[PDB]
Amino acid sequence: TVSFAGQLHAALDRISDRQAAARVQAEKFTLGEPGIALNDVMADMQKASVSMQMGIQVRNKLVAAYQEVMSMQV
């Protein structure tokens, strides 16, 4: 039993946990906790940025498709 709303929720969760993980890593690196490396912080931030751009582009395509379908006349 597939669910498009469930799939969208799972994708949004994936993006949000990626962003939160990068944010918490930056949190710990700023606080001075040992074991965190600056290059890893920057790489995780850039990965989160790429994931959010993925989400934004999929949003744009889906909204455009929905608007073009709903702008049709029967």
């Binding site: 930056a26 949190e27 700023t30 606080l31 912080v41 940025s49 959010m52 934004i56």
Partner: protein, 110 residues
Amino acid sequence: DRLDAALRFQQEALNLRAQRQEILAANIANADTPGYQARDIDFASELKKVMVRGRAVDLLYRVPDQPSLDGNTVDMDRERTQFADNSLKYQMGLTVLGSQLKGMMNVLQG
């Protein structure tokens, strides 16, 4: 507001780094002042207090390395090293805060 809460950490850390840079610059400027004890602040504890309480830092004395007859505590090697490290961490904070703001702006971009 949530827009403040999501951006609060890096802004407060950046402000604390600016204040500690001011303190380190005061330590370096006083490198030859007799009877001057080098001062600093503990960044982690102060930032934790700033987040927990809400927005007057505790100036802790630096332990001297070697005794000087003029009573000057400022050790210039440690001060230069900490100044460079503080500058680098300030650049880091600027970059991360800018990344967050630019991510929000790119989200809003239609």
